[PDB]
Amino acid sequence: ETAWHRYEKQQPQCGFGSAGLCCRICLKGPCRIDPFGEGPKYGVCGADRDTIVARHLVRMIAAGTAAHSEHGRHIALAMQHISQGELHDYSIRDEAKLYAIAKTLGVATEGRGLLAIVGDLAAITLGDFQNQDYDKPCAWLAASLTPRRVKRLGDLGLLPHNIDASVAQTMSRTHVGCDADPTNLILGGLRVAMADLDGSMLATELSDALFGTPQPVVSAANLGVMKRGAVNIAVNGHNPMLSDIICDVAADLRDEAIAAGAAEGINIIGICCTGHEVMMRHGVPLATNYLSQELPILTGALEAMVVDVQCIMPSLPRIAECFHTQIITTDKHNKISGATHVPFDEHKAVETAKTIIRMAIAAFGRRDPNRVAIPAFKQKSIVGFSAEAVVAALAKVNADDPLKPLVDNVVNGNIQGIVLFVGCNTTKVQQDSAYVDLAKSLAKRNVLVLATGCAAGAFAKAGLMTSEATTQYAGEGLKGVLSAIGTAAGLGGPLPLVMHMGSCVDNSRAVALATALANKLGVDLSDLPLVASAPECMSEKALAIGSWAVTIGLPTHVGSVPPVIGSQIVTKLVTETAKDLVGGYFIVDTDPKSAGDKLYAAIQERRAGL
Amino acid sequence: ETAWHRYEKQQPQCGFGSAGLCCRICLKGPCRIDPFGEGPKYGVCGADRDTIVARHLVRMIAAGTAAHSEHGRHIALAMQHISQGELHDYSIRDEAKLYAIAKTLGVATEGRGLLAIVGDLAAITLGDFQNQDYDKPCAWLAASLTPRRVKRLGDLGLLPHNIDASVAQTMSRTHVGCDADPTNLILGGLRVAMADLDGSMLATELSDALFGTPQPVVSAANLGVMKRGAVNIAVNGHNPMLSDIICDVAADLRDEAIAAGAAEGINIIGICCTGHEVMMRHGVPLATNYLSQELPILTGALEAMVVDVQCIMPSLPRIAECFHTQIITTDKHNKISGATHVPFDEHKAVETAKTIIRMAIAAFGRRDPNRVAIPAFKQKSIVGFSAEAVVAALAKVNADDPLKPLVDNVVNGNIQGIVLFVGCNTTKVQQDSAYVDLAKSLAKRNVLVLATGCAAGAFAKAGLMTSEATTQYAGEGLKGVLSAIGTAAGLGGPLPLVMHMGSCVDNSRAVALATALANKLGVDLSDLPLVASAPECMSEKALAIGSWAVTIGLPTHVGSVPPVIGSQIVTKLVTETAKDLVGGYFIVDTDPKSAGDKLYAAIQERRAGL
Ligand code: SF4
Ligand code: SF4
Numbered sequence A, B: 001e002t003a004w005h006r007y008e009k010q011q012p013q014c015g016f017g018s019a020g021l022c023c024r025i026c027l028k029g030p031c032r033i034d035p036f037g038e039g040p041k042y043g044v045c046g047a048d049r050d051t052i053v054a055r056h057l058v059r060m061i062a063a064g065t066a067a068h069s070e071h072g073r074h075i076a077l078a079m080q081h082i083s084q085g086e087l088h089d090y091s092i093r094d095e096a097k098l099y100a101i102a103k104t105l106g107v108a109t110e111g112r113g114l115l116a117i118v119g120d121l122a123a124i125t126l127g128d129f130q131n132q133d134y135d136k137p138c139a140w141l142a143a144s145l146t147p148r149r150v151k152r153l154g155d156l157g158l159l160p161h162n163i164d165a166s167v168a169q170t171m172s173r174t175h176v177g178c179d180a181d182p183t184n185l186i187l188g189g190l191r192v193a194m195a196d197l198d199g200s201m202l203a204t205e206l207s208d209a210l211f212g213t214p215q216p217v218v219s220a221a222n223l224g225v226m227k228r229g230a231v232n233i234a235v236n237g238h239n240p241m242l243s244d245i246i247c248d249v250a251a252d253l254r255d256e257a258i259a260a261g262a263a264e265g266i267n268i269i270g271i272c273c274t275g276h277e278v279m280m281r282h283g284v285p286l287a288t289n290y291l292s293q294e295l296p297i298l299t300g301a302l303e304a305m306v307v308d309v310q311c312i313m314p315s316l317p318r319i320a321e322c323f324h325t326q327i328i329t330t331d332k333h334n335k336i337s338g339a340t341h342v343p344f345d346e347h348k349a350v351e352t353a354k355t356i357i358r359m360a361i362a363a364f365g366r367r368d369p370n371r372v373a374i375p376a377f378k379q380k381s382i383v384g385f386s387a388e389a390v391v392a393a394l395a396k397v398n399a400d401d402p403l404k405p406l407v408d409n410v411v412n413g414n415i416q417g418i419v420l421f422v423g424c425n426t427t428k429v430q431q432d433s434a435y436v437d438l439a440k441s442l443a444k445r446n447v448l449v450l451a452t453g454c455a456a457g458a459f460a461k462a463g464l465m466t467s468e469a470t471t472q473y474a475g476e477g478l479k480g481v482l483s484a485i486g487t488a489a490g491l492g493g494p495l496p497l498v499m500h501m502g503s504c505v506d507n508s509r510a511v512a513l514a515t516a517l518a519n520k521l522g523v524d525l526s527d528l529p530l531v532a533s534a535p536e537c538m539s540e541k542a543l544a545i546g547s548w549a550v551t552i553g554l555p556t557h558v559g560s561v562p563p564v565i566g567s568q569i570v571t572k573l574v575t576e577t578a579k580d581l582v583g584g585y586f587i588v589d590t591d592p593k594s595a596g597d598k599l600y601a602a603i604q605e606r607r608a609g610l
């Protein structure tokens, strides 16, 4: 029983829910709203469909914010311990970025010396979680956005002051008998959404400092990245603090495994974000994205799967009980009944990593040799395109103004615009269907493609993160500059039709490049022919990313349809009133083809304004 | 169209929801679970009914925590501004108590200056919102609970370290693909629940400092308390920072109302908690509780209703549009479409209060004289029983050991035990039905009755918060001591059959008295014949109160049935496994009579253990 199966058995899923016409915020419920048939028009409390549809959308964003923030808070606490001599398993693999950061956050570095620079950053970052002054914007946001944007959101009161405080006041204002005005609720949601970005930036930057900002690297994707002769260990989740250490400890045991009868040694494969984290920095091959995370077990060649936080199906234990596979959970706030828990203490990272990998080297000799079945499918992929890497490549075409070439080409027409693919894998859409057709769709129209998360995972497996992939679908105008830069660098040919910018949080990598280009033109993102698209979004996190994408200024496309249609006022606010208030807006459309046209249309419309 | 009407139109409310067998945590949903008919047994993600039922219960608690905490955070920030000279509208009152928090901590007291400590307390309290050390318990909790409890919860990891952080990590661990283990989820819920208490204590104590710890006072309840000769202004919500100032400015504006044609002047009536706040401290009469908050408008004699935060029906504007009544909202995170917004700036409290009251003195001359209709119903009530007041009364019977008499009588049998009534008004139960029958039920069996919130509002209107009320229902044993203390006190006949201990947050007033008695006996609450009951609970806040009531050690009764039955594992954890782990447990029963018997049975069982 797979995810696709379970999905089928759910059919037909509740219509009231899908419409957002249901509310279980209090026990006087569950109240539903009859849109037409003049049945119930209000909740027992008096709440109307507009209110009802609004609070739920908002709480979904807050939850997404809380998911990302918790990822960041973790790394921020790591810096703190580092700048205090603790956690001797983690260092500053890139004092350069650790330095650039300080620069941006107004943190003095001059003759100071690392651990004080590591420490202040930790206090500022952690500050974004403790500030009680509703009017003091979060540091990272105020420091990382075009000054024009900071000025705009600030006047609208859409700039958050505290990540945790934002999630909480969001849940607090949507309690029964609280914030009911549709407009006020949606604005509050846009604000918490900004707290998601803040946490995302905070998390990406500091992550680069701890493990190294990613640079171009070749890798592989899909299940066909599992050695028959190797101990296969999959890492799935979002926190790199564990996976990265595992990759290190893994190599160290390039022997113990061989001993246990592992010819090709230890073969760790990634899944989702944490997988994207190690695939981005190091060569580590990506096994698969969200919906397909169970399929690796069926292979009958997966010794163990180490999971940390979020986007881990609770079904894994069961599916695994059918084989030898071990489902090892690691976080206190992330346990799954059936899995075997091995608390990951960062202060004892390497030590815990070894225990876990050992558990795998053991389960290896317990593997059924006659049940193995590993698809040949092994799509090659070129990943590791951090905002730095991108500017670094543009340097090899103009070391004085790396942005010059990029600016020019968009002005003449070679590059019509840029599409940022972010998002998940919904069952209400074919695995990686929309992603591929939408990418090719716009890439032909001379639109540059950037992708993160599972969306990026899709393109990886699809083979669009390839040099030739560009030579085969990139409309001339685009294909031109694409190959120039690529050649100007160490890759036989052009850049990938799709550039892998990292995990979900790494969407800030895109926000950074965008703001850089935007400042060069002395303009704002709400002016660039920059567009966002989430073809198969599903999670509350995804819903958050999309919301701030819209508040940053980008026209955002969602191909899943959030619980909004049940309310026209709300549907209006987020797809029309947003165009003014904040410049960005949502574009709901479940037809890839239709979406692409609306997207390109927006890119073209943005063009006009320049 | 009233709340009762809207409720009817909702009938029959979804069964899946009621059962907790539905999940809209991500877009791959909404997934529902078919309990029997072997339909869908899992969510498209793999989540099972146990998981599904658990995350929702937890997130409800987190939301409740966020509601209460936000109330506290507000007052804590007020102290901070106070200890800095800003906020020239507010000050202190009753310091002998301000040093009952300025002691309930490593508070540096002795000759240091008040407006210096009304800042240290502010830093500690605010600390409970910023601490990033998962292992450092919140100050107020560690300082206000029996040391035995602190030791117990601490070993179980059920002691929160940061209120806001608790809500957020709660939302984070229940995101799709996160914490799925039923036991782990419920434990995490119990912890966030403790963050609700922390916020509640934090909020009550500091509130007493700012406006005066409540002492016995006589008052009135129910609509009747209104008056055509007066300008009627109702305050509804939870934050006393506004209402209290209004009561002052109200008296002030003398030649302002009478002039406008207001014979009896300005008559401000309360509703819910904020109403309980001013009814507790000052004589301010309570108009009504939750479900009946709209009825005051129909009276046709309500000039205006000033609402701040939470438990304010979104229907008020509409209902009011039929009259002259003004629905004035005041908080940025609490707007209702239709109401007229008047931002309440504390730095300009008195100034804003005057604007609002003026708006009322105006709407007064716009009142329809031929549509007025104010019920005669005006039940008298004796309220203001803070934990202090209770010990103060017990002093007048033994100034050496105020607790002595109280301890003794429970040991001999005069007082079988104590029931704490907390909770709301659900439509799935008659207005204040269960409350009254359950109160009399146990009071006959010699059980002392304490009540807060709307539950307490009920008893107020019912007339059980009366001296004679005791002479008429209190079983001898109880009735005995009840009258002794009452007589010994400077009031009149025996104490009220039901003692009003304040608003929802003031449930800590009860936790305080309980812990005091518990320490005297050198025992824990999980040992006292102390029991909690929420006959008509409805809100996420109520669900939180109940959860920590259970974690503190009390056997808690809920008469609404949270979305739990759909899961036996969960139902088990919170009503059986809790008996061990933490000593308290839930007692779900929708039949007042049946409930009372189980309650008294638990009180009796607790007795046995002593
Ligand atoms: S969304 Fe609401 S109405 Fe639909 S199944 Fe879930 S609880 Fe029931
Ligand atoms: S908050 Fe209002 S609409 Fe939602 S369940 Fe409660 S009564 Fe119904």
Ligand code: SF4
Pocket: B023, B024, B025, B026, B027, B028, B029, B030, B031, B042, B043, B044, B045, B046, B047, B052, B175, B176, B177
């Ligand atoms: S989290 Fe799981 S059970 Fe809940 S809606 Fe999503 S797929 Fe369904």
Ligand SMILES: [Fe+2]
Pocket: A238, A272, A273, A311, A453, A454, A503, A504
């Ligand atoms: Fe992710």
Ligand SMILES: [Fe+2]
Pocket: B238, B272, B273, B311, B453, B454, B503, B504
């Ligand atoms: Fe309340």
